[PDB]
């Protein structure tokens, strides 16, 4: 009959100060003018509350709000059907959950804030869903009822009985070091205690993960990649049926992430149920039998789809649209420059730019070797390889931060540098920090599109850096490097802590400015997609991690990608509809043919 619609109000308390404009929401609102209930003022907490029943959907309150604290949306009653859990009034609410299946791996992919982490907790038995209502400390009985008609119903009965206790590898990567310590109780101690499997289990898992060096080090001491892998080890070592992984690719390098994926899949063989959440598509494809996609606006809502297949789910993800849901989850589709697309220019050749000679940097524990290479103007070079290879070391030497043991690089160039792991260590607020760097760049329209508008830094401006978040801080750092003028810019691993949309904003940023400005940039990365878009040449690193390493001169996109991918031995085809790289299995039918041709990738992409 009539169209079915709803209104949902979510307000962010961080953004709201009702002293500032007085309580302007209660006034202003036409519902309240009549004497209705749409917005009620909470006198104890001093927060405005908007009731969804009485609200008109007018949106008058939204544009009145001096910050942008209130958000009213109108949905066709898509969310109402699905309600799983709600944090509180006017807060994040979760919709649907991912199915678990024995003997298989089920994937999850989505943008941050969707409730991927929350979903894991509910499945874990850590949190009890309220069901968008009263549902108390684990009143699991009601949860089963809500899930009826879904395959999770059987799972919730199992969980309540405590027949199975799921093992969880914790999500937040930044949080782990502070929580766990063990200089004495290093990594080795944890692996010994947890090993329910065999004494072989300790050895086998350590070898495949490339943990051998790290056992002696303590947990707090570990680097990001090392920290992640230890968690993985415990999740194999444990005896249980259900192994939940939440973002296992985080911090890891390209070689290691693939390794993690294979080992985790081994659980499926013992017929143990596995669940996993990933931001990386290469890794996600490899692990999963089934895939769920989580979509919706960040921090407002996030719904889980029906289970799908591995290929199908990935294909649908890339279009940016889901048909049943009928939502354009992403505003713009992702595309990579063909390399036909790029501008044709004559580049500074001859002494294009500066050149570096052979370089060596030796710690006495690790040795880096570099081959003389050349850099030209207005180009960009990708740096790839596994961590511990001295990818980080090389960039620092060029920065002038590090002194080479051998070789010399004294350029008369101004360098801007962006560090790999970002930890605050700066007193002051976010805005102040940006402003010292450059005020003018904050004015430009491009910076509005990429930084300011999406995150809402305006709210962030007063907040402290210590108080801040991981991914938010990352986009800020990348932009800041770009803040100041320099002949050459250096960035180290921009993809960390970022979801799909966030990385891709970065890809466009580096390529566009470098082209306009006619300056050079070196970017290190693990994400294959990012490298393709930005670069014109690449340097590949090889050797053995935590031991020795080597670097190469810059070489063309096609040439460099063949070398890199040859090292992994996994080829990528193309999906004809989505135009994504389709992981071709080794011994894929196609794998053999592609290797013969010497083509690891298709539809090679280059800088714009």
């Amino acid at each position: 009959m009539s169209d079915k619609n709803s209104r949902i109000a979510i307000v962010s308390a961080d953004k709201c100060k009702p002293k500032k404009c007085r309580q302007e929401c209660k006034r202003s609102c036409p519902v309240v003018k009549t004497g209705k209930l749409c917005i009620e003022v909470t006198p104890t907490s001093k927060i405005a509350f908007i009731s969804e029943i009485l609200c008109i959907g007018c949106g008058i309150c939204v544009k009145k709000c001096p910050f942008d604290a209130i958000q009213i949306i109108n949905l066709p009653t898509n969310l109402e059907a699905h309600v799983t859990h709600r944090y509180s009034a006017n807060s994040f609410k979760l919709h649907r959950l991912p199915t678990p299946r024995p003997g298989q791996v089920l994937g999850l992919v989505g943008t941050n804030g969707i409730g991927k982490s929350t979903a894991l907790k509910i499945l874990a038995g850590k949190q009890k869903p309220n069901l968008g209502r009263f549902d108390d400390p684990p009143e699991w009985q009601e949860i089963i009822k809500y899930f009826r008609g879904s395959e999770l119903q059987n799972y919730f009965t199992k969980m309540l009985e405590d027949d199975i206790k799921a093992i969880i590898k914790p999500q937040y990567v930044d949080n782990i070091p502070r929580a766990i310590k063990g200089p004495v109780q290093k990594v080795g101690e944890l692996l010994k205690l947890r090993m329910e499997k065999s004494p072989e289990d300790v050895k086998r898992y350590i070898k495949i993960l490339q943990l051998e060096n790290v056992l002696k080090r303590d947990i707090e001491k570990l680097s990001g990649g090392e920290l992640q892998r230890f968690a993985i080890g415990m999740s194999c070592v444990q005896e249980a049926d259900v192994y939940m992984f939440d973002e296992p690719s985080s911090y890891l390098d390209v070689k290691q992430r693939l390794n993690a994926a294979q080992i985790i899949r081994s659980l499926l063989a013992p017929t143990k149920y596995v669940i996993c959440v990933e931001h990386d598509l290469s890794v996600l494809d490899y692990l999963s039998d089934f895939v769920c996609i989580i979509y919706g606006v960040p921090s407002v809502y996030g719904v889980v789809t029906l289970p799908a297949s591995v290929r199908e789910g990935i294909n649908i993800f890339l279009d940016g649209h889901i048909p049943a849901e009928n939502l354009r989850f992403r505003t713009e589709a992702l595309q990579f420059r063909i390399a036909d697309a790029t501008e044709d220019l004559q580049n500074d050749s001859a002494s294009r730019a500066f050149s570096y000679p052979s370089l060596k940097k030796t710690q006495g524990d690790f040795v880096l070797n570099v081959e003389e290479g050349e850099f030209s103007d207005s180009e960009i070079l990708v740096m790839m390889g596994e961590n511990g290879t001295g990818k980080t070391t090389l960039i620092k030497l060029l920065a002038g931060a590090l002194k080479p043991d051998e070789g010399q690089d004294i350029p008369k160039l101004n360098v801007s540098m962006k560090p790999q792991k970002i930890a605050p260590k700066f007193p002051g607020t976010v805005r102040q920090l940006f402003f010292k760097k450059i005020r003018g760049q904050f004015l430009n329209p491009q910076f509005q599109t990429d930084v300011v508008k999406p995150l809402r830094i305006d709210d962030i401006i007063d907040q402290e850096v210590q108080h801040l978040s991981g991914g938010e801080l990352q986009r800020v750092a990348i932009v800041l490097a770009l803040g100041i003028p320099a002949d050459i810019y250096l960035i180290d691993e921009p993809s960390a802590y970022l979801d799909s949309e966030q990385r891709i904003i970065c890809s466009k940023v580096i390529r566009r400015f470098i082209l306009h400005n006619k300056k050079t940039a070196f970017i290190v990365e693990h994400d294959f997609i990012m490298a393709t878009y930005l670069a014109d040449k690449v340097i590949v690193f090889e050797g053995i991690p935590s031991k020795n390493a080597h670097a190469r001169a810059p070489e063309s996109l096609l040439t460099g990608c063949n070398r890199f991918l040859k090292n992994l031995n996994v080829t990528f085809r193309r999906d004809p509809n989505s135009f994504r790289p389709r992981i071709n299995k080794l011994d894929s039918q196609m794998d053999k043919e592609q290797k013969s041709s010497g083509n690891y990738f298709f539809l090679d992409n280059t800088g714009i």
């Binding site: 036409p30 519902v31 003018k33 009549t34 008109i56 007018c58 008058i60």
Partner: protein, 282 residues
């Protein structure tokens, strides 16, 4: 009352008239002649025919000029639209010619066929035109309304709502256009004494409303002395406030928005304001 005038033509004849509620009466009619020269004719396949489209162009401006010269006194059109009628092409040859007066082509509101003309075709032109009339009405109300309103409230606050707000700003002459409705639910009442009074705004549901009516100090429950409709009071004193008036009901898109929000009500400002005051504040 609301006045519409129309011109129904053929070569047999032509006819002018109006309706205003039940009222209905023609004004004038005339004829010319002409068999149809595109047959018989001859070595003059244009000689005779060019007198005849000329005599149509004489006819149709003598029609439409008389409709202007007695529908309008005091610029443009005094009526607020125009209609054309006839057999197939005999009226397309009007609305796209050099010989229908400029500024009059800008005022057509429907174009109708009728199987026959005169007084039998006039009832047919009222009856099937009903649709056109409804369309025009909608375009005027809904649209224009729904449009202007939202399209450009008048950012920062160049607005008021409610009686309290919409009236002070109407008293201040800060309201370009006042937006009411017809079935207004607010009226001006007086609850007062031996040498003084209070004016409050009341609706239907009397809860706390009846409660107050007073202030506080003197302490006096209440007595209503008189009651004057706000809609009417406004409907009749709009010139005094300089605010410009539009009455409306409930029919159209964004129509439902007014009922839920701007409930027969709304003031649009000339310049930009400071919103109502009161006193209950400290």
């Amino acid at each position: 009352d609301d006045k519409f005038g129309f011109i129904v033509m053929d070569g047999q004849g032509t006819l002018f008239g109006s309706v205003s509620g039940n009222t209905r009466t023609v004004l004038h009619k005339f004829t010319v002649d002409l068999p149809k020269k595109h047959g018989r004719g001859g070595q003059s396949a244009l000689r005779f025919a060019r007198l005849r489209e000329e005599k149509r162009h004489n006819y149709v401006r003598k029609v439409a000029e008389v409709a202007v010269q007695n529908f309008i006194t005091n610029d443009k059109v005094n009526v607020k639209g125009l209609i054309l009628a006839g057999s197939a092409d005999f009226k397309t040859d009007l609305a796209k010619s050099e010989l229908f007066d400029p500024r009059l082509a800008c005022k057509v509101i429907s174009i109708v066929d009728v199987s026959y003309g005169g007084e039998n075709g006039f009832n047919q032109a009222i009856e099937l035109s009903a649709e056109a009339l409804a369309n025009v009405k909608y375009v005027q109300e809904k649209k224009l309304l729904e449009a202007y309103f939202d399209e450009i409230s008048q950012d920062t606050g160049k607005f008021c709502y409610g009686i309290d707000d919409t009236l002070k700003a109407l008293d201040l002459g800060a309201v370009e256009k006042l937006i009411v409705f017809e079935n207004l639910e607010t009226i001006r009442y007086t609850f007062k004494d031996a040498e003084d009074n209070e004016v409050i705004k009341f609706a239907e549901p009397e809860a706390k409303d009846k409660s107050f009516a007073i202030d506080k100090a003197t302490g006096q429950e209440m007595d209503v002395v008189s009651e004057e409709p706000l809609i009417e009071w406004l409907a009749a004193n709009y010139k005094n406030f300089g605010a410009t008036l539009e009455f409306i009901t409930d029919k159209s898109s964004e129509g439902a928005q007014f009922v839920t929000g701007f409930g027969g009500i709304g003031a649009m400002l000339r310049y930009k304001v400071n919103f109502e005051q009161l006193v209950d504040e400290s």
